[PDB]
Every structure is written in C-alpha cells, then in structure tokens.
Amino acid sequence: MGIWQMDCTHFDGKIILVGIHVESGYIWAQIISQETADCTVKAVLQLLSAHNVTELQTDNGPNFKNQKMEGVLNYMGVKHKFGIPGNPQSQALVENVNHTLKVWIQKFLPETTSLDNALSLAVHSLNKK
DSSP, X not given: OOEEEEEEEEETTEEEEEXXXXXXXXXXXXXXXXXXXXXXXXXXXXXXXXXXXXXXEEEOSXXXXXXXXXHHXXXXXXXXXXXSTTOTTTSHHHHXXXXXXXXXXXXXXXXXXXXXXXXXXXXXXXXXX
C-alpha cells in the first residue's frame, strides 16, 4: 500500500528517526544529527527516494509538519496524514515500535561497540525472520 509511519525518538540524548512500512511491518531507523526541520526532511527525502512511498503518517510537530516537508511531500506525490504526538490515527504503530526498539537497543548496548551498531542489531531483531 506504500504507507510509511514515522517519528523521531530519543536515546541517551541521540535522535533516532524511525519508520515502519505499514503493510509489511518492515522497520527502518537512522540516527540523525539534530532534531530540526532541516535534518528531519533530509533523512525523510532519502527514504522517499529509495522506497515507493504513497503516504507518510507523522505527528504534527514542527519537525514533520512544516512548509519544507510539505513542499517535498507534494513534489514527491506523497499524501501527508498527521495528528498529535501518540495519536492512534497516524502514530499508533510507530509509537509501539519506538518503545520496543529502545528495549532492544538497551539489550544490545553492552554487546556492541557503538550506539549505531546497537541500533542496527535492534532493527534486525524487529525485522527477524
């Protein structure tokens, strides 16, 4: 169906952008430098370039809902659905991903050499098959 649901989450002061491909459950995540509109759109545009996205479901905060993001999503032909943080219409799935992801990161932290490596293993655990 091409719907992705995204949010940022925080881990020890680092910012992690997370997406779930709604129809399959596939999880994507990347550490991003700052929680800002510019940094968020840069990371989203490249996800959009790599995957065939028809709709993006986000919260309504200034990092996901702003004129730059609006322009990118309109140029890319992506419908934008949004609502308050944690809302069940556009954020239910990724909220629960974020809770689970960060438990896995905690599990892998002592088993890895960096947060980025712990994140990769956490995402692999969520995607495991």
